[PDB]
Amino acid sequence: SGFRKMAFPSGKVEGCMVQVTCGTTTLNGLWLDDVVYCPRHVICTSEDMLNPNYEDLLIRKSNHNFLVQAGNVQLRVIGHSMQNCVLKLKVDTANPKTPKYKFVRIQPGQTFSVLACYNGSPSGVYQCAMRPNFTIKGSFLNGSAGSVGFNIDYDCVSFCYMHHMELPTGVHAGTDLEGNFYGPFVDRQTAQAAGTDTTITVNVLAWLYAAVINGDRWFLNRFTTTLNDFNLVAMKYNYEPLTQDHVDILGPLSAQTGIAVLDMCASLKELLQNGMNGRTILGSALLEDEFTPFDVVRQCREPMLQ
Amino acid sequence: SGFRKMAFPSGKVEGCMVQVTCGTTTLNGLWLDDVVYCPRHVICTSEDMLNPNYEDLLIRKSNHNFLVQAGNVQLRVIGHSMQNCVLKLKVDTANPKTPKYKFVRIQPGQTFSVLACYNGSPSGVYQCAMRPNFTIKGSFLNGSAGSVGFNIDYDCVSFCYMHHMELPTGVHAGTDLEGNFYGPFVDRQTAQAAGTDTTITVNVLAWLYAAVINGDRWFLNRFTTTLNDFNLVAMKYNYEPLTQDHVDILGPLSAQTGIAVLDMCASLKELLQNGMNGRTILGSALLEDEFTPFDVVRQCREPMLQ
Ligand code: NA
């Protein structure tokens, strides 16, 4: 038993991380087969990062202006192109450690593992949720751009995030691997207007189920409510709407614990209306919303099947 | 910026995990050079996990009785021995992915990364701290024994923990890689209370420095305290004593922020006596104690040196 924020094992992704240097600017790249993907602002000086004309900046670069290092080994860039906010650097050797992979665009409320990297070298791994306002609350310093976020599903690494920037509020923003930002952000030094964030209701419910499975039951009440009435409550506390699809997704956790989803919703309603009584749930003194139903079943599942 | 619980990249350890099966008992082993290290209870049936004379049960076992699998590849066992609570299986093939490594014994309050594994296959990675009662608050299911804890320094993996068991209280206990348990625990189905879990004071102070560096400042005050006057308060709340060695370890964080260690002690003293009053620190409504000063330095340092 136990419940901990857990990342996927990072080795398959570590074997893909490289350093990309243009001039005096260094960040990370993702080396898959014969292409290195990286944030386009590697072609900027620090001053260029204020109001870059990326098309013009890229035209002045040639292949040999891109210094790509895979460990101690320099990879030769033989082509370059820009796709949205990422560069694709074709190199003359393919990465023999390329995992089976795909590029996906994740949805707000979903989680992924971040492999934080500096100078092409993996430094740390942690789990992030894509916030409803399309930021992530991560830990990133200068030089971390090009670090990626991913999930691992059977025989496949699904890359969903490439890190680009830190908003002046201290939260983080980036793109999918097609180079399109999550949220209304741009890779330049201008006002970045993140939406007011909200709490991921389906995830809070999943985490309450995790707590029950681990013996933390004090917050259960015998009340139940309707989906519409719960959502009227959720709205008041800046919680996202709970849909029938969410209720369905919580089905396995509901079945395992014997607690109907709308029963647990009534327990969550009482926690929102009356507080947590100075008590903790799974070691937290706040309601936690960065665990998906799948994250919870990964650690807490007890199959009826024997 | 930002501050997140972060694990070390797990790839170097992933390449060392194997499955060890004896009869119908399976768990994980750590394959370094031509030795596989695993918990000795793999030689026991689930029922035999009570009053097991491991020396007796081991003598009944031969090399062929140990099925060691590195993925789908079987490793021929050519010798077997017991060191305290670990089995060492000599295999006929050195692990070609063996990293530079050390076995170390960690102290309470220190952190490490756990690569949770089942059937020799890594499932997740998270950061944990050795509690003052020598337990770990982890996330471990049956079949996770033999999962290891570690830290990485440059290229060297320091293995400090091998998982064995879950106490009936739901916390976790294990050994170093020489098989010596951390704490007064035995790998037997017998009563074994852990000591009182206390709060790692020096780590709480480190985390408050992290908070200040990330702009959380509301808990700073004009109170002063001596070290002993602080310990007289914190001992009443089951906080570990703060020694002058801890004060010295916090020096670099004190210097970066300009907040004397004892002035941050005066802040912590107030938080203990009176709570947060509905406020949070780094997204938590409780005082976090599983980040070491080094953990804080890794993510928040702002070196004077340029
Ligand atoms: Na209820």
Residue numbers in the entry:
A (entry chain A), B (entry chain B): 1 to 306
Sentences from the paper on this structure:
The main protease of SARS-CoV-2 (Mpro, also referred to as 3-chymotrypsin-like protease or 3CLpro) is responsible for the majority of nsp processing, cleaving at 11 conserved sites along the polyprotein including self-excision of Mpro by autolytic cleavage of its own N-terminal and C-terminal autoprocessing sites. SARS-CoV-2 Mpro is a functional homodimer of two symmetrically disposed protomers that are each 306 residues in length (33.8 kDa). The active site of Mpro features a Cys145-His41 catalytic dyad, which orchestrates nucleophilic attack at the carbonyl carbon of the invariant P1 glutamine and the formation of an acyl enzyme intermediate central to efficient peptide cleavage. Using C-terminally substituted Mpro chimeras, we have determined X-ray crystallographic structures of Mpro in complex with 10 of its 11 viral cleavage sites, bound at full occupancy intermolecularly in trans, within the active site of either the native enzyme and/or a catalytic mutant (C145A).
C6 (form 2), C10, C14, and C13WT have also crystallized in space group P21 but with a distinct unit cell, two molecules in the ASU, and a unique conformation of the donor substrate (we term here form 2 - see also below). Interestingly, the others diverge from this canonical binding, we term here form 2: in C6 (form 2), C10, and C14 (crystallized isomorphously in space group P21 with two molecules in the ASU) the substrate sequence is kinked ~ 90° at the P3 residues and tracks instead between the dynamic Met49 and Gln189 regions. This altered substrate trajectory appears to be coincident with the close contact of the donor C-terminal domain in this crystal packing. P4 residues in all substrates except C5, which interacts with Gln189 Oε1 form a hydrogen bond between main chain NH and Thr190 O. In the non-classical (form 2) poses we observe here, the P3 side chains (Thr (C7, C13), Met (C10) or Arg (C14)) instead extend toward the S4 pocket due to rotation of the P3 main chain, perhaps another reason for the restricted sequence diversity at P3. In the form 2 peptides, P5 and P6 are redirected between Met49 and Gln189, possibly due to the dramatic shift of the Gln189 side chain, reminiscent of motions observed in the C5 structure to accommodate the unique P2 phenylalanine. Primarily small beta-branched residues, threonine or valine, are observed at P3, with C8, C9 and C10 having extended side chains with significant aliphatic character (lysine, arginine or methionine).
